Amino acid sequence: PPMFSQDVFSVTLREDVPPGFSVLQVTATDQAEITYAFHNVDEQVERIFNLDKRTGEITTKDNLDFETAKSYTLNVEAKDPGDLASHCSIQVKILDENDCVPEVIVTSVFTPLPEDSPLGTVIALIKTRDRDSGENGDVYCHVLGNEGFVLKSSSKNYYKLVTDRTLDREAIPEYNVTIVAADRGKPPLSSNVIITLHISDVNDNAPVFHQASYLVHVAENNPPGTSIAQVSASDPDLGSNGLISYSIIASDLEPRALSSFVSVNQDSGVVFAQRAFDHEQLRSFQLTLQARDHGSPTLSANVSMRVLVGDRNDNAPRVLYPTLEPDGSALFDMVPRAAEPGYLVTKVVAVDADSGHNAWLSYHVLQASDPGLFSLGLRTGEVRTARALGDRDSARQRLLVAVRDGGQPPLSATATLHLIFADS
Numbered sequence: 389p390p391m392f393s394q395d396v397f398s399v400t401l402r403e404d405v406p407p408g409f410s411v412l413q414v415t416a417t418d419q420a421e422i423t424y425a426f427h428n429v430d431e432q433v434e435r436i437f438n439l440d441k442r443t444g445e446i447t448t449k450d451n452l453d454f455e456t457a458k459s460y461t462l463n464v465e466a467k468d469p470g471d472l473a474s475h476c477s478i479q480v481k482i483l484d485e486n487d488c489v490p491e492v493i494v495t496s497v498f499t500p501l502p503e504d505s506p507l508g509t510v511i512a513l514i515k516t517r518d519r520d521s522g523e524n525g526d527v528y529c530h531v532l533g534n535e536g537f538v539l540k541s542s543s544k545n546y547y548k549l550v551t552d553r554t555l556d557r558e559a560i561p562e563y564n565v566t567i568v569a570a571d572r573g574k575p576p577l578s579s580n581v582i583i584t585l586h587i588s589d590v591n592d593n594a595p596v597f598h599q600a601s602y603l604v605h606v607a608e609n610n611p612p613g614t615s616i617a618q619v620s621a622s623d624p625d626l627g628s629n630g631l632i633s634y635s636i637i638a639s640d641l642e643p644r645a646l647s648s649f650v651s652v653n654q655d656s657g658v659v660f661a662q663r664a665f666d667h668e669q670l671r672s673f674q675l676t677l678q679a680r681d682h683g684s685p686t687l688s689a690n691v692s693m694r695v696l697v698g699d700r701n702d703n704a705p706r707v708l709y710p711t712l713e714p715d716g717s718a719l720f721d722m723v724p725r726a727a728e729p730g731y732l733v734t735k736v737v738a739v740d741a742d743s744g745h746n747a748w749l750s751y752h753v754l755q756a757s758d759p760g761l762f763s764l765g766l767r768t769g770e771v772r773t774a775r776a777l778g779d780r781d782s783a784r785q786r787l788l789v790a791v792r793d794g795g796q797p798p799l800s801a802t803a804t805l806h807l808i809f810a811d812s
């Protein structure tokens with residue numbers, strides 16, 4: 389009868405061997421034309437291996453896969469031309485190769501991630517799978533870059549992605565975090581996943597005024613409701629946290645009369661004069677405005693504004709001396725004829741309610757019955773004789789004088805001076 393060299397053969401195959409790979413040849417001995425056949429084998433044996441009925445060579449006819457089957461049991465029956473038969477078994481062991489990529493499973497991503505999250509806030513939960521065995525299935529993760537995110541390993545194949553750095557939406561509003569996982573096989577395989585992080589806003593920025601303080605000039609006699617300035621503050625926060633409202637909180641004026649002077653539009657920051665300013669009553673006043681955001685809690689800043697009321701020429705000069713008659717004339721009839729040049733006949737005394745050039749007075753002769761007999765001090769308003777009185781000079785003299793300010797246009801007052809020389 390036929391007989392195999394032994395009952396049980398053992399071979400190992402790498403899962404990556406191509407179809408048609410030589411597994412083993414088994415032969416029985418007539419000591420002839422013997423037939424070989426599988427018997428009592430699994431269905432997958434018939435589907436993976438080919439047994440030469442005449443030669444007894446065994447080859448694969450399809451691809452292997454350690455993840456699907458780690459071993460095969462092959463029973464071969466040898467039949468000579470007679471009825472007798474013999475059997476042997478071949479236990480085929482499959483070897484694991486690194487042919488399965490690691491995969492990364494990310495859940496519970498903190499979306500969005502508040503910018504005030506404490507150190508150690510759990511952003512995401514990470515889990516790794518690897519269908520291979522042993523080292524080929526041993527996966528480890530790490531984060532690329534140094535943007536402030538660290539992987540904490542709670543147990544094997546489980547990670548927590550945590551912050552280790554204070555966040556700031558105003559500096560970095562979005563993050564792309566790449567987590568890479570690699571196995572420890574030969575050669576190693578790796579995969580990666582990109583976690584996108586949206587940093588949500590917190591009201592952590594107070595409004596800031598565009599200027600450290602405000603110096604405003606407003607011409608006197610302005611209409612009420614005249615826009616005199618516009619404050620502006622900025623706030624990098626989002627939405628309600630960056631919405632600014634302006635207001636007036638303090639002033640060196642009477643608190644009950646503050647609204648009667650100035651206001652500010654709460655949305656535009658335009659500052660209005662609520663009344664016609666009068667430089668002669670008040671030259672300047674101080675003001676403290678506030679910019680406030682609409683966050684919880686609110687943030688604010690304070691800025692000082694000074695308003696300078698500008699002088700206009702709204703007052704004409706007025707003569708205080710000499711006293712004038714209803715016709716605007718004054719009489720000086722005791723002027724001695726022997727008066728030496730420089731004799732002070734009289735002095736026009738005028739005042740002006742304004743300031744600066746608007747109240748800088750100058751005195752002019754408009755009409756003279758004898759030009760050059762009398763002089764008129766341009767700035768003093770002193771009326772003096774300029775030359776010795778002559779024999780052909782009239783006893784009665786008349787001057788029409790004007791006191792003007794230095795405004796534009798110049799306002800003035802006039803007076804007629806009857807100067808009458810007395811005979812000795």
Ligand SMILES: *[C@@H]1O[C@H](CO[C@@H]2O[C@@H](C)[C@@H](O)[C@@H](O)[C@@H]2O)[C@@H](O[C@@H]2O[C@H](CO)[C@@H](O[C@@H]3O[C@H](CO)[C@@H](O)[C@H](O)[C@@H]3O)[C@H](O)[C@H]2NC(C)=O)[C@H](O)[C@H]1NC(C)=O
Nearest residue numbers: 559560561562563564565566580581582583584585586587
């Ligand atoms: C985080 O990453 C995403 C996605 O980026 C994509 O994948 C990466 C691995 C890289 O290969 C990138 O090059 C790739 O875009 C960024 O999203 C943004 O996606 C759009 C989609 O096309 C990118 O292109 C724009 O698409 C519009 C669509 O109409 C075009 O009109 C634009 O002209 C533009 O091309 C966009 O570039 C991309 N932004 C990037 C790469 O910065 C996401 O922005 C990124 N986050 C950060 C903070 O960088």
Ligand SMILES: *[C@@H]1O[C@H](CO[C@@H]2O[C@@H](C)[C@@H](O)[C@@H](O)[C@@H]2O)[C@@H](O)[C@H](O)[C@H]1NC(C)=O
Nearest residue numbers: 594637638676677678679687688689690691
């Ligand atoms: C800006 O100033 C505001 C004014 O509030 C009042 O005035 C001052 C003089 C203090 O006495 C203050 O306590 C009063 O309530 C404040 O309300 C506000 O907090 C200030 N903001 C900043 C950023 O300083």
Ligand SMILES: *[C@H]1O[C@H](CO)[C@@H](O)[C@H](O)[C@@H]1O
Nearest residue numbers: 409410411412413445446
């Ligand atoms: C192909 O090669 C293998 C090498 O071991 C043999 O075992 C087989 O029988 C066939 O000759």
Ligand SMILES: *[C@H]1O[C@H](CO)[C@@H](O)[C@H](O)[C@@H]1O
Nearest residue numbers: 568570576577578579580
């Ligand atoms: C997975 O990603 C790593 C990145 O380090 C590569 O080196 C590797 O070859 C595979 O592409």
Ligand SMILES: *[C@H]1O[C@H](CO)[C@@H](O)[C@H](O)[C@@H]1O
Nearest residue numbers: 614615616617618658659
């Ligand atoms: C209101 O309007 C005046 C001009 O009329 C500006 O000067 C002011 O700043 C505010 O915008």
Ligand SMILES: *[C@H]1O[C@H](CO)[C@@H](O)[C@H](O)[C@@H]1O
Nearest residue numbers: 597598619620621622623
């Ligand atoms: C005044 O200017 C600030 C910027 O400094 C703006 O935020 C504001 O809207 C106004 O234009």
Ligand SMILES: *[C@H]1O[C@H](CO)[C@@H](O)[C@H](O)[C@@H]1O
Nearest residue numbers: 790792798799800801802
């Ligand atoms: C004084 O001067 C002004 C102009 O300077 C006149 O308008 C006024 O009537 C007076 O003569």
Ligand SMILES: *[C@H]1O[C@H](CO)[C@@H](O)[C@H](O)[C@@H]1O
Nearest residue numbers: 715716717801802803804
């Ligand atoms: C001075 O003179 C002018 C010109 O006559 C008058 O208008 C004024 O009232 C004052 O008498």
Ligand SMILES: *[C@H]1O[C@H](CO)[C@@H](O)[C@H](O)[C@@H]1O
Nearest residue numbers: 715716717788803804805
């Ligand atoms: C001063 O007074 C005389 C009249 O006495 C006027 O003629 C002159 O214009 C000014 O008013």
Ligand SMILES: [Ca+2]
Nearest residue numbers: 453454455487
């Ligand atoms: Ca496989």
Ligand SMILES: [Ca+2]
Nearest residue numbers: 454485487520
């Ligand atoms: Ca494998």
Ligand SMILES: [Ca+2]
Nearest residue numbers: 488520524571
């Ligand atoms: Ca693997």
Ligand SMILES: [Ca+2]
Nearest residue numbers: 556557558592
């Ligand atoms: Ca911030």
Ligand SMILES: [Ca+2]
Nearest residue numbers: 589590592625
């Ligand atoms: Ca913010």
Ligand SMILES: [Ca+2]
Nearest residue numbers: 593625629681
């Ligand atoms: Ca804010």
Ligand SMILES: [Ca+2]
Nearest residue numbers: 666667668702
């Ligand atoms: Ca005035």
